[model samples]
Target: GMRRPTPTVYVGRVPIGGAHPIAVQSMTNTPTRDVEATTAQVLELHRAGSEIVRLTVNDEEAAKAVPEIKRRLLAEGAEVPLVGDFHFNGHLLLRKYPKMAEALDKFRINPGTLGRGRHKDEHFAEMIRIAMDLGKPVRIGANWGSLDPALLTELMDRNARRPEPKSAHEVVLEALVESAVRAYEAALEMGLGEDKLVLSAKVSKARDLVWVYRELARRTQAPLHLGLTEAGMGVKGIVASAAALAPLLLEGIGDTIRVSLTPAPGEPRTKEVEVAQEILQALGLRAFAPEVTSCPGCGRTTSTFFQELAEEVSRRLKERLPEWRARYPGVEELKVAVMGCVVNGPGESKHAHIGISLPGAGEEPKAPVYADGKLLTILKGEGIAEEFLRLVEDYVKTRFAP
Candidate 1:
């Protein structure tokens, strides 16, 4: 599939759009003024595969802490791009603290929250000017929760006057697209080039989010940042985000992505980053870690041993991934399968790089392991899981080692 053509925008050393791998992003919920917490969260997100990390820069203290956080991250050996999420006071903060302006690789401006009338134009232009002066990229991110009232009102009024009016939902979608596009144009007119701009119109619902992005993509060439905003909590958030993002991504409309999951209390923020990587990996767009394919057992497989083996294999692969990724160059592309019963066991096992088919209810108490579609061994003993793991390790060492 052909990616939507867009100018490449750089956030620090990371390049987004223009055929680069779709970048993963996440934001810190930590108070930005608490530099320790913010820096730690940024580092954690980066280590967990977030290419770009954003933190709120809504106040003077938060703005002041930006450069210090960057310094700490760099001192700790992380060079992930840092983005400042700005609202009403961004222009003042950016202008007041040149160091903060220089610290951020990108600035995310919510066009709606920049204020109304003259204040809106002035503030938006000032933010763009600072970005232009610093050579920093800008993301004109429009969310339904903070949509530009003027634009929405104008769009709504226009729709109401039309001989054949569209649905109210349709008008809001149009307003979102217009809001982002107008900001993009305004930034360009302020001397920031197309290469210095990214665009996004995020909504909570899957269907509306898709519509907004599709329209935004059609109206502009800026790299589109994709996300389903305020995507609820836990499984609901994950599923809703995936449903909203996958369709647009499959159509090659998004250049970067964030799964805005509301983490449960005591949950790590890295879960959001992990979810984003999983989405990309599942789409076959990118590979992060080795994937294990296992099937849910049926009537033919009545024992719990098959389930245990599959779980163990999956757990071990993930636990070893950090070490394996360092030593084995192509290990992330590896596919391992653990199947139960004979119905489709061997066929599915043969499809993976290394696979094991365990015995079913009435079959001989044995397991056949395949490597690259060729039978390598038949295990009939007390340690099938352990033996299979050893084979997987050996395969990784032999097949993926540099």
Candidate 2:
């Protein structure tokens, strides 16, 4: 793979931008000051395949808990790169608490949320200075909903004076892109090197998100963090993120991505990580788990056993990953198919690494399991799922042995 235009930056040991694998990111909604819950959630995200996890460091208590959170996560054997999301008082907090600054692998600064006018420059500069001193990477993140009132107003005034006036939304979009670009430039002016910088400009709307990133991709040469901020909950969030990210990713634009889904009440934070991984794997960028090709039951297939088997197989694969990764070489990319009926079942099953084709109603009472395009076994009656799982376990051990 060819490297992108930007220089690479390492968040802890993970390299971002250039030819490195596109990283997946998620943020914890847990209150940062609640060290116990926050630490548990960070571990969950790490186990769920999140490469970078962001925490909201909003106040003094949150800042003090940063070190504790990192320490506990390390003790749990999950030391993924931790990022601090800083807004208005980051300059003061980072200055006041040395351990908090040291605990985070990377720092995220939003140009929009940091006060206005001279206060903005001073705060931004101080944050960059700290990053430079600590040799830590920083992300200059800009969000549409939180765009600096001053900057938007200034741009709107300029637009109004133009012969062909632009819509307020148009002016604000330009301001959002300009804000990120200028902040990166300002960080450079403050003696932060190219290798310690990342850029992101988040738009809530899908079309605006794509356009902003496309423009930023053309104008800047820093690793980009892509996300559609405030992407609503449920299917809307998933569809919006996919639509915004897919086009830019196809054109080789983003270096890292986060699917910012508002979690439903009682939803696990790992849902965001799962969605990010699915998007990347669906686009053929990377694979976090094995895939299951299961059919939607049809008129010909009256049995519901295939559906149950498919769900169980998928769950068991995820559960067995820690063992598989330790024991076998390439288990994450394994392909397993569970199909119903005789129409396309055998062909699909033979195509996967290991698969099963169960007989439909009124057909033979046996199910055939295939491994490596060869017929391995035929089984009848109950315990079908159990026997099939055993066959898969054996296939994995034999074919993927270290």
Candidate 3:
């Protein structure tokens, strides 16, 4: 699918929109005042494939810690772009903490969170001015949870007067788009160029998110950051995020994405980064690691051998990815299939770069492996797993060597 044409905005070295790959982003849950914890989380998220990492700059201590966290990350050889997620005190922080403003590659401001009346306009403009002076990009993120009440009331009242009024849900969606677009225009009027801005309107529901973004896309050409806010926890978060993001992405709407999963207690924050990567990869938009395609075994394949083999193949590929990435360029594009039984096994196997088809319950004991659409060999006995992995490694070296 062709991407919507948009002005490219750079968050440090990473580019968003205008034909660039849809960048994956994640947020650090560590206390920003703990420079060590925040820096470590940033590095971990970067290593986990987050192109940009955002951390809260909610207080004086947190604001002051930004530069140190950035310094620590760089000291550890991670140069991932850092974005400051600011709310009420963003204007004050940007004004008081020059170092923090300088350290951040991008500033995210919620128009809804800014104060009401002239204070809102003044504060929003002040942040935009700071971004302009520092030559940084700003994401005008508007969430339904904190949407500007004044704007919503105005729209709500206006809608009530119409002959056929729209639902409160419809009005809320319109208000989100309005808040973001007004901020975008205000920033532009303040002399921040189109290249220096990104926009987002986040809603918790999947369908509402789709509507807000589709409307935002129609109204502006700024790079868009996509997310389904407060997307709960576990598989529900993953599924909700996918259901919302996939449609807009397939229609070529988003430029950067975040899967805002509320990590379970003790869960690593990098899971959000991984899920974002999976969404992009599943859409065939980008590849971060080699993909393993394995089938679900059925009654015909009674033994647990095929399932174990499939698990091993996936685990080994992930374990060796970092090394393989360095030694074999384009190895991430490789497709490897591990199939159980002959039902659709051979056909599917033949379609992958390297694939193995294991036997069923009453069939021959041998397993046939295919490479580049041709039969490579048959495997039997205890060495099958080890032998197959060796063939995979060899294939990677031979096929992806530069």
RMSD list, candidates in order = 1.1, 2.4, 1.1
User: What digit string (tens of lDDT, one per residue) describes model 1 on residues 88-199?
Assistant: 8998999999999999999999999998777999898888888888888999999999988889999999999999999988998899889899888888877898888999
Q: Which stretches of candidate 3 lie over 4 Å from their true place?
A: none
Whole-model Cα lDDT of every candidate shown, in order: 0.91, 0.89, 0.92
Please rank every candidate by lDDT, starting with the best.
3, 1, 2
> TM-scores of all models?
0.98, 0.91, 0.98
In model 2, where do residues sit more than 4 Å from their true spots?
1-5, 157-166, 361-363, 366-368, 373-381
Best-matching candidate per lDDT: 3
lDDT of 2 at 301: 78
For candidate 2, write residues 232-332 as lDDT tens digits: 89999999999888888878889999999988998888998899998888888887777888889787776566678889999998888888988987787
